[PDB]
């Protein structure tokens, strides 16, 4: 899997939440919706790669947000890859969604499908406009809002690892869940609640899991997602959108290959995929 170009577009609005799993993260405001950030992120990647929308073979989306996806803020399905196809004019593409997958796992699976089918230009997009999810005020956990676009050329050569979190090996980590709001009264109310129990050692356990997984490919430089503010400068973190600056630094430094590592809060694992770089 070769990364041709990266696009990223985050809201300018940051919100700080206290708690062991808190931090300062980008947060969409008002009735901002995901497409207003996703479309410019995608166009930035296509422009960098000199790839026209009609040349896109495949669009695969990742977005948990249950509303505020598109102009009609009440639509949850079909998922955002489809309206993206429409507004982009990617009239030859196949579209699907990999729901709560990590980006690393999605990139591995898509490298496999797309190389097998002979595709040349594949868009993997990740975004949130999470106004419809209640943050976890007990732990401080919230999703970062924004959009990340990876324009990729498949090779079928990407390698993959799914690894344990670090820290106490006898620690049972309690996963993220998003229960449905059982008391929706107005169409604009939250549709679900983020629930990630307060676990003070979790941010460090994730980072230790990253470092362990990176040891499977010691020859490779690597990039990673930062879902928590703990121990980060100013408590600021961008979740999976942290990957954009790291990938761009790798391009500036003319790296040809790298390892990309995701944190999956549902599985409480880390997942890595090896990549080529333009």
């Amino acid at each position: 899997m070769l990364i041709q170009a990266v696009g990223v577009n985050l809201p300018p609005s940051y919100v700080c939440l206290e708690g062991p799993l808190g931090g300062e993260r980008p947060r969409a405001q008002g009735d901002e919706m995901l497409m207003q950030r996703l479309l410019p992120a995608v166009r930035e990647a296509l422009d960098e790669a000199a790839v026209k929308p009609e040349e896109i073979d495949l669009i695969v989306g990742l977005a948990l947000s249950p509303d505020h996806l598109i102009e009609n803020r009440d639509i949850m399905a079909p998922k955002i890859g489809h309206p993206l196809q429409k507004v982009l004019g990617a009239n030859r593409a196949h579209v699907f969604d990999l729901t709560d997958s990590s980006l690393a796992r999605a990139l591995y699976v898509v490298d496999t499908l797309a190389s097998d089918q002979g595709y040349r230009n594949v868009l993997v997009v990740r975004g949130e406009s999470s106004q419809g999810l209640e943050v976890d005020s007990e732990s401080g956990f919230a999703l970062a809002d924004g959009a990340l676009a990876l324009l990729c050329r498949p090779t079928g050569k990407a390698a993959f690892r799914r690894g344990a979190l670090g820290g106490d090996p006898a620690q049972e980590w309690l996963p993220l869940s998003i229960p449905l709001n059982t008391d929706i009264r107005q169409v604009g109310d939250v549709k679900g609640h983020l629930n990630l129990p307060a676990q003070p050692g979790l941010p460090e356990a994730v980072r230790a899991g990253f470092t362990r997984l990176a040891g499977d490919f010691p020859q490779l430089n690597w990039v990673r997602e930062e879902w928590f503010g703990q121990g980060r400068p100013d408590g600021r973190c961008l979740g999976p959108f942290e990957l954009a600056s790291q990938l761009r630094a790798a391009q500036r430094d003319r790296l040809d290959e790298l390892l990309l590592i995701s944190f999956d809060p549902f599985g409480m694992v880390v997942e890595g995929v090896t990549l080529e770089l333009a």
Partner: protein, 352 residues
Amino acid sequence: AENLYFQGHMHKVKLAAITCELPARSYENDDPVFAAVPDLSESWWQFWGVNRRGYFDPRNGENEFSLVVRAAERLLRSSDTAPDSVDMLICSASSPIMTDAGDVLPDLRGRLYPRMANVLSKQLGLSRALPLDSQMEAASFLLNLRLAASMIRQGKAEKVLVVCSEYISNLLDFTSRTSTLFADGCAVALLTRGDDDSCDLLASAEHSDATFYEVATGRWRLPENPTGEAKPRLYFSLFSMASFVPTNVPIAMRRALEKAGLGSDDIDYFVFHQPAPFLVKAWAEGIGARPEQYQLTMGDTGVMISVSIPYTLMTGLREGKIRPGDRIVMAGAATGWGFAAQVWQLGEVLVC
């Protein structure tokens, strides 16, 4: 030989086993569940081809998870598949609302996330399975077969368990005619690396077109014809194109056949998604399939979104319409919209 060296070969993909699990209770077209639906008529019922359909009964322990556990355990046992030999589990569920996580997350009730594969892998003891949850609405069974096949072909998995579980009834607005056709059900299939050429996925073609994305959606809204203090819910919603779906499934089939180097005359049998008799017939006529080469199965099940195709495949195998050695085409449409077709050489498929 062609070269002094040996050419690499993609692994053959065996469709090894399949089963389905449907709701215990069936609802006829005059069932009181439809008492608040307006504008019904015998012409409506006769047109869509559904005479009865099933909805999960969660009060009696039926839901998208429990019936999958039952079906998958049955298939693993019947196919003699050790849980630890499954390398990947690919699940789909078109309703965003899940309701049960078994013994894995026993306190979780209605939920948007997580999806199914990770919790199901733990419930079934699939200790080596990479879990994936994919979404292509009514074409998800085909998408999952395609994902599985590519993993197997490239040597990245040797056994892949595929699950589709449709709890669509938890999104249906029963004050609206939109509630009258869709229905619940589950399907499980096992794909493996083939040990001979008796079975393989010869080719597939997937494509999407979002021109009419807004026509068929899941939207947070009040009921169409509410009563009292109705609350907003996530509902299947239909907004107000004639030839779009009739033509695009044949487009996908023609592309898949071309990639396989075959024509429709080379195909023994066809398996279609089951949205309506007129649509299945239009797809068949668009590719040259005669009525003796496919079944209409929505009459007694309703339109089970992604489960219609695997149910219809299973029916054809069970009834002897599809035989070992047959070449078949499986094809359907999905909201979004998406289209998928697959050309299979089938061997012996275990129906369990």
